[PDB]
Design an enzyme around this catalytic site. Structure first.
Site, PDB file in Angstrom:
ATOM      1  N   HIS A   1       0.759  -1.248   0.000  1.00 49.94           N
ATOM      2  CA  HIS A   1       0.000   0.000   0.000  1.00 49.94           C
ATOM      3  C   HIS A   1       0.790   1.298   0.000  1.00 49.94           C
TER       4      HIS A   1
ATOM      5  N   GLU B   1       4.304 -34.634  -2.205  1.00 47.05           N
ATOM      6  CA  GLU B   1       3.250 -33.894  -2.891  1.00 47.05           C
ATOM      7  C   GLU B   1       3.920 -33.105  -4.046  1.00 47.05           C
TER       8      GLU B   1
ATOM      9  N   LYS C   1     -12.370  -6.701 -12.885  1.00 42.84           N
ATOM     10  CA  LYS C   1     -11.351  -7.442 -13.609  1.00 42.84           C
ATOM     11  C   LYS C   1     -10.946  -8.657 -12.746  1.00 42.84           C
ATOM     12  N   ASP C   2     -10.847  -8.463 -11.431  1.00 40.39           N
ATOM     13  CA  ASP C   2     -10.499  -9.551 -10.508  1.00 40.39           C
ATOM     14  C   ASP C   2     -11.572 -10.642 -10.526  1.00 40.39           C
TER      15      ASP C   2
ATOM     16  N   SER D   1       1.237  -0.803  -6.490  1.00 41.12           N
ATOM     17  CA  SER D   1       1.686  -1.868  -7.383  1.00 41.12           C
ATOM     18  C   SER D   1       2.637  -1.356  -8.446  1.00 41.12           C
TER      19      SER D   1
HETATM   20  C1  HEM Z   1      -1.109 -15.960   0.929  1.00 39.81           C
HETATM   21  C2  HEM Z   1      -0.084 -15.276   0.112  1.00 39.81           C
HETATM   22  C3  HEM Z   1      -0.073 -14.051  -0.595  1.00 39.81           C
HETATM   23  C4  HEM Z   1      -1.078 -13.162  -0.769  1.00 39.81           C
HETATM   24  C5  HEM Z   1      -2.513 -13.204  -0.245  1.00 39.81           C
HETATM   25  C6  HEM Z   1      -0.555 -12.088  -1.574  1.00 39.81           C
HETATM   26  C7  HEM Z   1      -1.296 -11.002  -2.030  1.00 39.81           C
HETATM   27  C8  HEM Z   1      -0.826  -9.975  -2.835  1.00 39.81           C
HETATM   28  C9  HEM Z   1      -1.660  -8.982  -3.484  1.00 39.81           C
HETATM   29  C10 HEM Z   1      -3.197  -8.787  -3.268  1.00 39.81           C
HETATM   30  C11 HEM Z   1      -0.853  -8.230  -4.259  1.00 39.81           C
HETATM   31  C12 HEM Z   1      -1.278  -7.097  -5.218  1.00 39.81           C
HETATM   32  C13 HEM Z   1      -1.731  -7.616  -6.598  1.00 39.81           C
HETATM   33  C14 HEM Z   1      -0.690  -8.511  -7.254  1.00 39.81           C
HETATM   34  O1  HEM Z   1       0.385  -8.006  -7.650  1.00 39.81           O
HETATM   35  O2  HEM Z   1      -0.942  -9.726  -7.375  1.00 39.81           O
HETATM   36  C15 HEM Z   1       0.498  -8.689  -4.024  1.00 39.81           C
HETATM   37  C16 HEM Z   1       1.636  -8.117  -4.561  1.00 39.81           C
HETATM   38  C17 HEM Z   1       2.925  -8.619  -4.433  1.00 39.81           C
HETATM   39  N1  HEM Z   1       3.257  -9.781  -3.767  1.00 39.81           N
HETATM   40 FE1  HEM Z   1       2.015 -11.049  -2.827  1.00 39.81          FE
HETATM   41  N2  HEM Z   1       0.776 -12.309  -1.866  1.00 39.81           N
HETATM   42  C18 HEM Z   1       1.078 -13.523  -1.300  1.00 39.81           C
HETATM   43  C19 HEM Z   1       2.328 -14.133  -1.391  1.00 39.81           C
HETATM   44  C20 HEM Z   1       3.465 -13.586  -1.996  1.00 39.81           C
HETATM   45  C21 HEM Z   1       4.744 -14.254  -2.119  1.00 39.81           C
HETATM   46  C22 HEM Z   1       4.924 -15.734  -1.708  1.00 39.81           C
HETATM   47  C23 HEM Z   1       5.609 -13.359  -2.655  1.00 39.81           C
HETATM   48  C24 HEM Z   1       6.978 -13.470  -3.001  1.00 39.81           C
HETATM   49  C25 HEM Z   1       7.925 -14.403  -2.442  1.00 39.81           C
HETATM   50  C26 HEM Z   1       4.852 -12.166  -2.937  1.00 39.81           C
HETATM   51  C27 HEM Z   1       5.356 -11.033  -3.547  1.00 39.81           C
HETATM   52  C28 HEM Z   1       4.621  -9.920  -3.921  1.00 39.81           C
HETATM   53  C29 HEM Z   1       5.157  -8.763  -4.569  1.00 39.81           C
HETATM   54  C30 HEM Z   1       6.622  -8.442  -4.787  1.00 39.81           C
HETATM   55  C31 HEM Z   1       4.109  -8.011  -4.970  1.00 39.81           C
HETATM   56  C32 HEM Z   1       4.179  -6.763  -5.833  1.00 39.81           C
HETATM   57  C33 HEM Z   1       3.923  -7.054  -7.315  1.00 39.81           C
HETATM   58  C34 HEM Z   1       3.963  -5.791  -8.167  1.00 39.81           C
HETATM   59  O3  HEM Z   1       3.161  -4.877  -7.930  1.00 39.81           O
HETATM   60  O4  HEM Z   1       4.786  -5.719  -9.092  1.00 39.81           O
HETATM   61  N3  HEM Z   1       3.541 -12.327  -2.551  1.00 39.81           N
HETATM   62  N4  HEM Z   1       0.477  -9.835  -3.254  1.00 39.81           N
HETATM   63  C1  LIG Z   2     -11.194 -12.587  -0.166  1.00 38.90           C
HETATM   64  C2  LIG Z   2     -11.607 -12.790  -1.547  1.00 38.90           C
HETATM   65  C3  LIG Z   2     -10.845 -12.168  -2.637  1.00 38.90           C
HETATM   66  C4  LIG Z   2     -11.553 -11.939  -3.903  1.00 38.90           C
HETATM   67  C5  LIG Z   2     -11.448 -10.673  -4.634  1.00 38.90           C
HETATM   68  C6  LIG Z   2     -12.437 -10.422  -5.728  1.00 38.90           C
HETATM   69  C7  LIG Z   2     -13.107  -9.116  -5.834  1.00 38.90           C
HETATM   70  C8  LIG Z   2     -14.530  -9.170  -6.488  1.00 38.90           C
HETATM   71  C9  LIG Z   2     -15.696  -8.901  -5.509  1.00 38.90           C
HETATM   72  C10 LIG Z   2     -16.967  -8.521  -6.299  1.00 38.90           C
HETATM   73  C11 LIG Z   2     -17.693  -7.305  -5.640  1.00 38.90           C
HETATM   74  C12 LIG Z   2     -18.458  -6.563  -6.751  1.00 38.90           C
HETATM   75  C13 LIG Z   2     -19.192  -5.374  -6.154  1.00 38.90           C
HETATM   76  C14 LIG Z   2     -19.784  -4.463  -7.228  1.00 38.90           C
HETATM   77  C15 LIG Z   2     -20.641  -3.380  -6.631  1.00 38.90           C
HETATM   78  O1  LIG Z   2     -20.797  -3.298  -5.471  1.00 38.90           O
HETATM   79  O2  LIG Z   2     -21.184  -2.547  -7.578  1.00 38.90           O
HETATM   80  C16 LIG Z   2     -22.549  -2.073  -7.441  1.00 38.90           C
HETATM   81  C17 LIG Z   2     -23.352  -2.824  -8.563  1.00 38.90           C
HETATM   82  O3  LIG Z   2     -23.290  -4.204  -8.276  1.00 38.90           O
HETATM   83  C18 LIG Z   2     -23.943  -5.023  -9.156  1.00 38.90           C
HETATM   84  O4  LIG Z   2     -24.544  -4.690 -10.118  1.00 38.90           O
HETATM   85  C19 LIG Z   2     -23.835  -6.520  -8.781  1.00 38.90           C
HETATM   86  C20 LIG Z   2     -22.656  -7.284  -9.408  1.00 38.90           C
HETATM   87  C21 LIG Z   2     -22.631  -8.754  -8.959  1.00 38.90           C
HETATM   88  C22 LIG Z   2     -21.205  -9.271  -8.722  1.00 38.90           C
HETATM   89  C23 LIG Z   2     -21.265 -10.669  -8.132  1.00 38.90           C
HETATM   90  C24 LIG Z   2     -20.372 -10.816  -6.897  1.00 38.90           C
HETATM   91  C25 LIG Z   2     -19.606 -12.098  -7.089  1.00 38.90           C
HETATM   92  C26 LIG Z   2     -19.411 -12.880  -5.801  1.00 38.90           C
HETATM   93  C27 LIG Z   2     -18.170 -13.770  -6.002  1.00 38.90           C
HETATM   94  C28 LIG Z   2     -16.875 -13.120  -5.482  1.00 38.90           C
HETATM   95  C29 LIG Z   2     -16.180 -14.010  -4.438  1.00 38.90           C
HETATM   96  C30 LIG Z   2     -14.920 -13.309  -3.895  1.00 38.90           C
HETATM   97  C31 LIG Z   2     -22.700  -0.566  -7.870  1.00 38.90           C
HETATM   98  O5  LIG Z   2     -22.936  -0.339  -9.296  1.00 38.90           O
HETATM   99  P1  LIG Z   2     -23.112   0.954 -10.103  1.00 38.90           P
HETATM  100  O6  LIG Z   2     -21.686   1.473 -10.099  1.00 38.90           O
HETATM  101  O7  LIG Z   2     -23.553   0.781 -11.568  1.00 38.90           O
HETATM  102  O8  LIG Z   2     -24.121   1.988  -9.476  1.00 38.90           O
HETATM  103  C1  LIG Z   3       5.908 -28.464  13.593  1.00 38.18           C
HETATM  104  C2  LIG Z   3       6.211 -27.985  12.233  1.00 38.18           C
HETATM  105  C3  LIG Z   3       7.256 -28.385  11.489  1.00 38.18           C
HETATM  106  C4  LIG Z   3       8.249 -29.385  11.969  1.00 38.18           C
HETATM  107  C5  LIG Z   3       7.437 -27.833  10.150  1.00 38.18           C
HETATM  108  C6  LIG Z   3       8.425 -28.174   9.303  1.00 38.18           C
HETATM  109  C7  LIG Z   3       8.544 -27.604   7.981  1.00 38.18           C
HETATM  110  C8  LIG Z   3       9.507 -27.955   7.117  1.00 38.18           C
HETATM  111  C9  LIG Z   3       9.674 -27.417   5.732  1.00 38.18           C
HETATM  112  O1  LIG Z   3       8.705 -26.406   5.400  1.00 38.18           O
HETATM  113  C10 LIG Z   3       9.086 -25.093   5.780  1.00 38.18           C
HETATM  114  C11 LIG Z   3       9.474 -28.566   4.713  1.00 38.18           C
HETATM  115  C12 LIG Z   3       8.027 -29.024   4.682  1.00 38.18           C
HETATM  116  C13 LIG Z   3       9.936 -28.078   3.334  1.00 38.18           C
HETATM  117  O2  LIG Z   3      11.374 -27.920   3.409  1.00 38.18           O
HETATM  118  C14 LIG Z   3      11.832 -26.645   2.983  1.00 38.18           C
HETATM  119  C15 LIG Z   3       9.561 -29.035   2.173  1.00 38.18           C
HETATM  120  C16 LIG Z   3      10.102 -28.465   0.871  1.00 38.18           C
HETATM  121  C17 LIG Z   3      10.061 -30.459   2.421  1.00 38.18           C
HETATM  122  C18 LIG Z   3      10.097 -31.237   1.127  1.00 38.18           C
HETATM  123  C19 LIG Z   3      10.246 -32.722   1.256  1.00 38.18           C
HETATM  124  O3  LIG Z   3       8.995 -33.300   1.350  1.00 38.18           O
HETATM  125  C20 LIG Z   3       8.916 -34.670   1.444  1.00 38.18           C
HETATM  126  C21 LIG Z   3       7.599 -35.195   1.529  1.00 38.18           C
HETATM  127  O4  LIG Z   3       6.546 -34.302   1.523  1.00 38.18           O
HETATM  128  C22 LIG Z   3       7.437 -36.594   1.610  1.00 38.18           C
HETATM  129  O5  LIG Z   3       6.118 -37.018   1.682  1.00 38.18           O
HETATM  130  C23 LIG Z   3       5.881 -38.419   1.560  1.00 38.18           C
HETATM  131  C24 LIG Z   3       8.549 -37.452   1.608  1.00 38.18           C
HETATM  132  C25 LIG Z   3       9.841 -36.907   1.527  1.00 38.18           C
HETATM  133  O6  LIG Z   3      10.978 -37.679   1.509  1.00 38.18           O
HETATM  134  C26 LIG Z   3      10.855 -38.952   0.884  1.00 38.18           C
HETATM  135  C27 LIG Z   3      10.053 -35.505   1.447  1.00 38.18           C
HETATM  136  C28 LIG Z   3      11.405 -34.900   1.365  1.00 38.18           C
HETATM  137  O7  LIG Z   3      12.448 -35.569   1.371  1.00 38.18           O
HETATM  138  C29 LIG Z   3      11.414 -33.430   1.266  1.00 38.18           C
HETATM  139  C30 LIG Z   3      12.733 -32.755   1.166  1.00 38.18           C
END
Ligand code: HEM
Ligand SMILES: CCCCCCCCCCCCCCC(=O)O[C@H](COC(=O)CCCCCCCCCCCC)COP(=O)(O)O
Ligand SMILES: C/C=C(C)/C=C/C=C/[C@H](OC)[C@@H](C)[C@@H](OC)[C@@H](C)CCc1oc2c(O)c(OC)cc(OC)c2c(=O)c1C
Ligand SMILES: CCCCCCCCCCC(=O)OC[C@H](COP(=O)(O)OC[C@H](O)COP(=O)(O)OC[C@@H](COC(=O)CC)OC(=O)CCC)OC(=O)CCCCCCCC
Ligand SMILES: CCCCCCCCCCC(=O)OC[C@H](COP(=O)(O)OC[C@H](O)COP(=O)(O)OC[C@@H](COC(=O)CC)OC(=O)CCC)OC(=O)CCCCCCCC
Ligand SMILES: CCCCCCCCCCCCCCCCCC(=O)OC[C@H](COP(=O)(O)OCCN)OC(=O)CCCCCCCCCCCCC
Ligand code: HEM
Ligand code: HEM
Ligand code: HEM
Ligand code: HEM
Ligand SMILES: CCCCCCCCCCCCCCC(=O)O[C@H](COC(=O)CCCCCCCCCCCC)COP(=O)(O)O
Ligand SMILES: CCCCCCCCCCCCCCCCCC(=O)O[C@H](COC(=O)CCCCCC)COP(=O)(O)OCCN
Ligand SMILES: CCCCCCCCCCCCCCCCCC(=O)O[C@H](COC(=O)CCCCCC)COP(=O)(O)OCCN
Ligand SMILES: C/C=C(C)/C=C/C=C/[C@H](OC)[C@@H](C)[C@@H](OC)[C@@H](C)CCc1oc2c(O)c(OC)cc(OC)c2c(=O)c1C
Lengths: 57, 93, 126, 248, 385, 385, 93
Positions: free
Chosen positions: E202, E272, E228-229, E206
């Site tokens: 933020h 996995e 778009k999302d 982006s």
């Molecule tokens: C549960 C995991 C994550 C969530 C919910 C998340 C969510 C987000 C969101 C909403 C954005 C803005 C839109 C986008 O660029 O996609 C963003 C941007 C970004 N995220 Fe994540 N992210 C996650 C994991 C990660 C990881 C694993 C990395 C890198 C190791 C990462 C790196 C970045 C970076 C660098 C940006 C900026 C991209 C740009 O604007 O050029 N994110 N993330």
């Molecule tokens: C945590 C989850 C992350 C997901 C991010 C995705 C973001 C999309 C959310 C959609 C909200 C749209 C609101 C539009 C609005 O308020 O405009 C309202 C109009 O809204 C509508 O006409 C209804 C659109 C129906 C969209 C269906 C929602 C989909 C539910 C699935 C999404 C699951 C995440 C104002 O419109 P106006 O500007 O013309 O006056």
């Molecule tokens: C209490 C919480 C604890 C202890 C958390 C520990 C977390 C550890 C790491 O995560 C951060 C670790 C999961 C991560 O290492 C970077 C993975 C890439 C490991 C990858 C991994 O998987 C295997 C696996 O899935 C198997 O399944 C049947 C069997 C495996 O051998 C035969 C492996 C294996 O040889 C390796 C390297």
């Protein structure tokens, strides 16, 4: 979709939430019946109902 | 950042209070003061003096409730004793 | 984060050498044409990451007329990108126009910054 | 890894339940249960299948109740605390042939016949593998294959050496509906029954899947159109530059 | 001012989701972040509803999951959604990370954002490991055994740490019960880390596909990017539903439908799919300690990128050489995964070792060398002298 | 500027606990909030560590807690801390709410802060209820039965809601397993509500014992209040330790050391002490539906205070009649609790009904009437003509 | 509000970009445009942009890796077949 067809029902307004929700309720019923009928017909002869018709004891 | 709604508190330099003028404050470093020995005599008289001004606000309501409780409790003990069986039958139904 | 001073030092060394120049420039020309930034109406100097003190100093010192023109090229490029098209051929930046207009401001800021850092850490030999 | 160690690849048969819109053939599930009961049940348990689940799938409530009552289950002890038995009911789970692992191994030359409730999902190849295994026992192992005493040769099994011998032979079962009980017919039927045992939600899951993919596909296409409309102003936006007069 | 801006709670929503100034040119690759937020929500919700029917006791675990599959109304949907959802979470995350790599999203001023991202990646991997252990199938027991044993490589105190993690002499009841408790916890820590991730994002906003400033032409998040999302949210749900309802066990391992057996490790054991590349890297080192260190280093090396990228422009869009090598890195990562799915045999061993070298060489040698070269090419390719 | 101010994460810590401008005169009653944060942390940490050894199955639940008491190293400390911690959480919360009542903390501009607080109170009571059910002792089974049955009072769909909550014919396995899953979840929802509570507090800052503006003389949180809060943190820990180590079961019920029995409700059944006043209010109404409604209304009535307090000055410090009636309310609440601990007998029934009337009368009649009288008293006691 | 650190992005009205002048933009309402009745056919010649211009950067690396994979896979298969027994013993041990 045709413009005049849409206009006769909603004119130049978008559909309101109340009508959207009401339509979703109707959709859910009709859609389920249609899918189920097509699905059961597609698998006619394989369903237990069909097997039970012939088979007995 | 986006414009946010104004409140009744700001931050250092613009706290939101009135302009101050004519007031002068003075303070001395904690390091230059007596090692917290001015406790007794300077706080024992003040203590209980503060509570002497407040105790009635707490004590009267407390007294009303404690006596209401005790009275009901004693009446209950009587109602369930052999001597209270007569009155128990009367007030219970 | 390689400084432009470092980049120029290596580049100039290549340009001044008849051998290296005839060997590297053609590949560099092809690299630039393949980069495709000119097809979006951009000059290389428009591509420089600006989120650093040196670039901010450079851009602040850039004369107004050029700043307005750089602004237009950037906006136009974003618009073309979002439409997933390239600009019409006649609007492409020509090789002659792909001039390092910001480079001198950048080099100047880098030299001043380098001197301040040296002066901030000078040792005195009595 | 050698071919023998990997095991012969199981070919793809035309299972009537293969395919996104296909349910199980319930007449096949029914015959399959009979093969399980008359042949497999002697060595294999089906611990995860409750009697009640067969109702409306392969048998009637009446038929399942009669089947359950043929077995005895532990009941609550009497008023004296003495243990007692009772006939099975719909809520009970299909009983296994052995009281414990030691007994199972003792009756199978030290080998333990696995539970078959999830066998179809617990093996690579699924139905194709189970079927191929059951119908893939040759009369003799290939030349040069040294088979340990008590073991059997089956190319589809990793290593080729399996502790279960061929058990399906033509007409060993007499199907109620008159279907010819060939080894391949029985193998096809038990495998279908076993697939149902592993995935009883199969038919309903695919039906819900049709509803879900249709609604989501429509939503996806609709969202693209809606997105394009909302972006139309920005997408067709036009810019013009007129260099300002030098003065500021 | 408008209530959405004035109200203490709504202002945050408005700031992040409604009025947030977005670069006009960000493409669909910038939609992966919202998808990751969706994934986290899907996992947490399906997880909690399944938790209501789950027993963590080692003798009850596998059967309770079967109970969810068989007895719970719509239980199979919850389970397949959770299992497949986890796979999709990793696919989208890999794409999100790859997007960042390609566009130089890790570069200043977004280093903090990137580093927080790496932490989230590690937490997500750990969370998925813990969850997989909860099923208590054969892959669960052995995965738990191998993964916990990774710590036995720590000199002097390694074995003690492992015994502590186990709560006994081996992966047993105490291990499974604590793993489930921890599996419930980490997703909330991830949520907190995502908030920190969003906060870092933020303050700078982006980046965009051109790699230049987006300050001259922004458009509000609401409507434009909200709708778009929605396009990719529906595509994601569609694809996920195809797996959930039509091919629910394709991404899993058949061995996990066999209850854990402490006395037998199946010959067909395979980690996995999303863990295969790191698995291959570990197997490439013929030494216990170095194999473990090298695998963890494969994740940590992501942190050097802001320092090894010597380029003066952000992103690969206008870089011929950088684009070529980025794709070499991507396909090399896929190959590592394929090698991990193979047995330890010739010539897979050498291939894994070479691919492992290429993985590290990318960050430590290829990026800095190629970026320096490109800086010079841009210079000499136009300047006269 | 200083790093604590420029850094995106530290700036939050700095604004909330280092540089936050505090009114110079806030007294020790303003230390309860930090104590509530401490309680929440104590509960979540001891809870997670116990969860590692807990089994939610109805046949294993009671025994798994005994396993924690007997076999887990320091398990008895974790359990006694968690159980006595819950009681302390409520005692401190009651004091926090009472302080607010006394000092007019619920008044504008802090209505939102107050309302979020009411929500937190409801979530905390619900969380404590869910946890108590997890022990699966006699009080657990019957508390689970009665409390879930509260919903059967909802006309038309009541019985269906109860059957849904139970997951069966009665409180059984499905019930305990879902209650534990939910008990794990709610504390995290409470943490998020606490963040919302703090955000609302931050925009206006704390009030003070004088009830007037604190803008003319503020002092930084750091050092002053950080060290003042430490004084109560240690006092709180000292008292909690006295109970945990020397009298760990005093605040509990012996019947909860008896496994739940679906066929027998003990004659000695009594709700947890912190629920007693509300239990007494329900018992005061000789009607099922009205009793349930009145009990929930006892909590919701807190929301009417910003509207029924007609006073022109904030707080009770300078109000004779208000101070008196505030203490009448406090002891009336304690009495309600004492009545709840008694049997439904004469004269406790009438006493409970009168105390119930007094409870509601305070908010709806006493506060508005008295505050109005006091406004006039302040006016005619100085102005003259 | 507390003093916050400078960044490279502001908000509406002070985004942090350079002063803009001389640029004029024009747009037309989406309501006044053709209802997206030209998706295909009109956008087919523009399509394959990420293909013709980007495919080689993806294709070459992909081809290199795929062939490297196929080569190694065919060899492994040979080594474990009857005919590969002698070479297996050579390269394995
Ligand atoms: C549960 C995991 C994550 C969530 C919910 C998340 C969510 C987000 C969101 C909403 C954005 C803005 C839109 C986008 O660029 O996609 C963003 C941007 C970004 N995220 Fe994540 N992210 C996650 C994991 C990660 C990881 C694993 C990395 C890198 C190791 C990462 C790196 C970045 C970076 C660098 C940006 C900026 C991209 C740009 O604007 O050029 N994110 N993330
Ligand atoms: C945590 C989850 C992350 C997901 C991010 C995705 C973001 C999309 C959310 C959609 C909200 C749209 C609101 C539009 C609005 O308020 O405009 C309202 C109009 O809204 C509508 O006409 C209804 C659109 C129906 C969209 C269906 C929602 C989909 C539910 C699935 C999404 C699951 C995440 C104002 O419109 P106006 O500007 O013309 O006056
Ligand atoms: C209490 C919480 C604890 C202890 C958390 C520990 C977390 C550890 C790491 O995560 C951060 C670790 C999961 C991560 O290492 C970077 C993975 C890439 C490991 C990858 C991994 O998987 C295997 C696996 O899935 C198997 O399944 C049947 C069997 C495996 O051998 C035969 C492996 C294996 O040889 C390796 C390297
Ligand atoms: C299994 C887990 C994942 C499941 C969920 C994933 C969903 C999203 C992942 C894909 C992705 O992010 O691809 C982004 C890439 C970039 O595209 P761009 O920004 O340059 O687009 C300009 C567009 O024409 C604007 O066009 P417009 O907005 O007008 O409509 C675009 C298109 C969007 O379709 C989508 O749903 C997005 C892919 O709608 C259509 O007309 C399609 C009709 C069916 O779009 C592409 O061109 C795809 C490249 C293929 C690489 C995929 C590699 C995955 C392994
Ligand atoms: C109970 C189970 C839960 C456990 C949680 C315990 C947490 C503490 C709760 C008590 C509380 O909040 O009382 C606040 C009340 C207001 O006080 P004030 O701001 O007007 O003080 C001015 C002070 O002299 C400044 O004095 P100073 O800062 O210099 O030291 C003060 C005193 C503080 O002690 C405490 O920690 C609180 C009791 O230290 C001592 O001198 C004690 C010597 C051993 O303190 C008092 O003055 C007491 C008045 C009666 C309250 C009785 C409590 C009802 C149960
Ligand atoms: C711990 C380290 C983690 C690292 C993980 C590495 C990621 C693993 C693989 C993830 C799958 C997806 C790969 C993501 C690559 C796309 C990233 C990206 O942002 O690409 C942008 C690029 C073209 O964008 P441009 O803006 O340059 O186009 C010109 C416009 N004028 O778009 C393109 O050039 C087209 C994209 C074609 C993608 C080919 C992907 C092949 C992946 C095989 C899938 C796996 C199968 C098992
Ligand atoms: C038509 C009825 C039967 C079916 C469908 C069936 C199916 C199977 C299957 C799928 C396996 C697992 C093989 C593997 O690990 O991949 C197996 C193993 C086995 N079966 Fe059966 N079986 C049947 C009847 C029998 C009978 C009647 C016996 C006992 C005489 C038996 C004894 C065994 C044993 C001992 C194994 C262990 C094999 C090993 O691990 O080496 N089976 N069976
Ligand atoms: C980021 C979030 C999460 C991830 C990545 C994740 C991942 C996983 C994975 C990979 C499995 C094994 C699935 C299988 O193969 O069957 C699993 C199982 C499980 N998870 Fe999660 N999970 C997440 C959050 C949660 C949460 C918050 C809970 C709440 C308790 C939860 C509860 C469970 C349960 C009960 C199982 C066992 C049933 C099953 O196997 O599906 N999960 N999880
Ligand atoms: C988990 C529970 C809670 C936590 C952690 C919490 C925390 C805090 C903190 C740190 C403060 C500032 C310091 C103080 O005045 O004590 C505060 C203030 C306040 N809280 Fe809470 N609180 C909680 C529950 C409640 C409840 C249940 C209510 C009301 C029903 C409430 C009402 C208020 C009000 C009105 C203030 C302002 C006091 C004033 O400055 O005059 N809080 N709270
Ligand atoms: C808002 C915080 C919490 C409150 C108010 C709370 C309250 C309670 C209560 C009153 C009990 C019954 C204690 C007894 O009489 O023995 C209990 C038990 C339990 N709680 Fe919590 N709890 C909280 C958070 C947690 C968390 C986050 C977990 C995580 C799983 C947890 C796990 C447990 C367990 C395993 C028990 C059973 C063992 C025992 O009885 O102490 N609690 N909790
Ligand atoms: C979840 C929240 C509940 C707790 C709320 C109460 C807040 C108390 C936090 C105490 C932090 C004190 C740091 C002092 C500091 O940084 O100043 C440092 C000095 O710190 C010290 O001298 C150490 C004092 C010992 C601290 C005792 C730890 C408290 C035990 C933990 C109790 C909480 C579980 C700067 O000092 P200087 O100003 O002279 O240069
Ligand atoms: C990590 C935790 C989450 C982070 C917290 C920040 C994100 C918050 C997103 C939540 C969206 C929900 C906002 C709805 C509340 C907005 C209305 C409001 O604040 O009205 C409030 C009153 O709210 C209440 O009484 C209870 C609010 C409880 C909300 C429970 C979810 C009116 O406040 P108002 O702004 O009008 O103050 C007057 C200024 N002259
Ligand atoms: C439910 C919880 C939700 C979370 C709410 C957020 C509350 C914030 C409280 C966190 C206190 C911890 C802050 C310590 C980090 C401060 C140092 C820092 O940001 O240095 C950062 C780099 O940080 C990293 O690489 C990793 C940070 C991970 C932190 C994980 C705990 C330097 O950032 P800098 O301000 O110097 O700016 C960079 C120049 N463009
Ligand atoms: C899935 C989650 C669910 C269903 C949550 C439900 C939460 C409901 C309410 O919390 C908000 C509720 C706990 C709260 O009502 C406002 C309390 C004041 C209820 C107090 C309460 O306790 C009792 C108790 O503890 C007992 O112990 C053995 C026995 C009881 O009778 C004999 C009672 C009882 O008669 C009442 C009214």
């Amino acid at each position: 979709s045709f413009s005049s067809l849409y206009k006769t029902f909603f004119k130049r307004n978008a559909v309101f939430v109340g009508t959207i929700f009401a339509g979703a309720f109707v959709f859910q019923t009709v859609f389920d019946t249609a899918i189920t009928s097509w699905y059961e017909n597609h698998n006619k002869g394989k369903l237990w109902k069909d097997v039970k018709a012939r088979i007995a004891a | 950042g986006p414009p946010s709604g104004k409140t009744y508190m700001g931050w250092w330099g613009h706290m939101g209070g009135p302009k101050q003028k004519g007031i002068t404050s003075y303070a001395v470093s904690p390091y230059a003061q007596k090692p917290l020995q001015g406790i007794f005599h300077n706080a024992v008289f003040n203590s209980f003096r503060r509570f002497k001004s407040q105790f009635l606000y707490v004590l009267i309501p407390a007294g009303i409730y404690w006596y209401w409780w005790k009275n009901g409790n004693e009446y209950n003990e009587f109602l369930y004793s052999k001597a209270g069986r007569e009155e128990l039958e009367r007030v219970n139904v | 984060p390689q400084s432009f001073t470092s980049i120029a030092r290596i580049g100039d060394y290549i340009l001044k050498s008849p051998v290296l120049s005839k060997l590297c420039v053609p590949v560099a020309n092809q690299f630039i044409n393949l980069a495709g930034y000119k097809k979006l109406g951009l000059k290389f100097d428009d591509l420089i990451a600006e989120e650093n003190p040196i670039m901010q100093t450079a851009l602040r010192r850039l004369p107004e007329d050029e700043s307005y023109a750089r602004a237009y090229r950037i906006i136009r490029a974003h618009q073309t990108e979002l439409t997933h098209h390239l600009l019409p051929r006649n609007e492409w930046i020509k090789a002659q126009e792909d001039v390092p207009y910001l480079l001198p401001y950048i080099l100047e800021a880098e030299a001043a910054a380098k001197e301040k850092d040296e002066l901030d850490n000078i040792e005195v030999s009595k | 890894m050698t071919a023998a160690e990997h095991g012969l690849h199981a070919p793809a048969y035309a299972w009537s339940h293969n395919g996104p819109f296909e349910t199980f053939d319930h007449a096949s599930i029914r015959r399959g249960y009979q093969v399980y009961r008359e042949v497999c049940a002697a060595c294999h348990s089906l611990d995860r299948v409750a009697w009640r689940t067969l109702v409306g799938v392969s048998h009637t409530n009446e038929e399942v109740r009669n089947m359950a009552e043929e077995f005895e289950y532990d009941d609550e002890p009497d008023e004296q605390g003495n243990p007692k038995k009772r006939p099975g009911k719909l809520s009970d789970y299909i009983p296994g042939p052995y009281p414990n692992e030691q007994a199972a191994r003792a009756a199978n030359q030290g080998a333990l016949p696995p539970d078959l409730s999830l066998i179809v999902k617990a093996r690579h190849g699924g139905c194709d593998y189970i079927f191929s295994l059951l119908t893939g026992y040759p009369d003799e192992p290939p030349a040069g294959v040294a088979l340990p005493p008590g073991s059997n040769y089956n190319p589809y099994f990793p290593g080729g050496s399996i502790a279960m011998a061929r058990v399906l032979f033509d007409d060993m079962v007499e199907y109620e509906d008159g279907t010819p009980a060939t080894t391949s017919q029985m193998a096809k039927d038990v495998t279908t029954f076993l697939n149902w045992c592993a995935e009883p939600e199969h038919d309903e899951r695919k039906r819900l899947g049709l509803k879900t993919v249709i609604i989501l596909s429509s939503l996806y296409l609709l969202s693209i159109w809606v997105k394009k409309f909302k972006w139309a102003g920005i997408k067709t936006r036009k810019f013009v530059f007129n260099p300002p007069k030098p003065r500021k | 001012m408008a209530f959405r801006k004035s109200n203490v709670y709504l202002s945050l929503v408005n700031s992040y989701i409604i009025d947030s100034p977005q670069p006009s040119s960000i493409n669909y690759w910038w939609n992966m972040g919202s998808l990751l937020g969706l994934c986290l929500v899907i996992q947490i919700v399906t997880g909690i509803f399944m938790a209501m029917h789950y027993s963590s006791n080692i003798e009850l675990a596998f059967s309770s999951v079967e109970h969810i599959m068989r007895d719970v109304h719509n239980g199979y949907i919850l389970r397949y959604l959770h299992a497949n959802g986890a796979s999709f979470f990793f696919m989208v995350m890999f794409m999100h990370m790859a997007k960042g790599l390609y566009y130089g999203s890790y570069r200043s001023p977004r280093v903090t954002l990137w580093n927080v991202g790496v932490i989230i990646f590690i937490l997500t991997i750990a969370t998925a490991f813990l969850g997989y252990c909860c099923v208590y199938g054969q892959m669960s027991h052995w995965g738990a055994t191998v993964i916990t044993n990774l710590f036995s490589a720590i000199p002097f105190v390694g074995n003690d740490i492992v015994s502590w993690l186990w709560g006994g002499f081996s992966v047993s009841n105490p291990t499974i019960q604590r793993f489930f408790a921890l599996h419930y916890l980490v997703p909330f820590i991830i949520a907190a880390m995502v908030i920190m991730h969003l906060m870092a994002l933020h303050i700078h906003g982006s980046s965009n596909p051109l790699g230049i400033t987006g300050n001259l032409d922004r458009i509000p998040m609401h409507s434009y990017f909200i709708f778009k999302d929605l396009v990719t949210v529906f595509l994601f749900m569609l694809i996920l539903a195809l797996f959930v309802f039509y091919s629910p066990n394709t991404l899993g391992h058949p061995d996990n439908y066999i209850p854990g057996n402490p006395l037998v490790t199946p010959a067909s054991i395979v980690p996995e799919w999303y863990l295969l590349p790191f698995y291959a890297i570990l197997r490439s080192i013929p030494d216990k300690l170095l194999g473990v260190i090298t695998m963890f280093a494969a994740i940590l090396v992501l942190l050097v990128l802001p320092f090894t990228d010597r380029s003066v422009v952000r992103g690969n869009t206008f870089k011929v050489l950088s684009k070529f090598f980025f794709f070499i890195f991507v396909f090399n990562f896929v190959l590592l995964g394929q090698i991990g799915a193979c047995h330890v045999e010739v010539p897979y061993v050498l291939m894994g070792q070479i691919a492992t070298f290429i993985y590290f060489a990318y960050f430590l040698i290829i990026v800095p060398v190629i970026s320096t070269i490109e800086n010079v090419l841009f210079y000499i390719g136009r300047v006269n002298k």
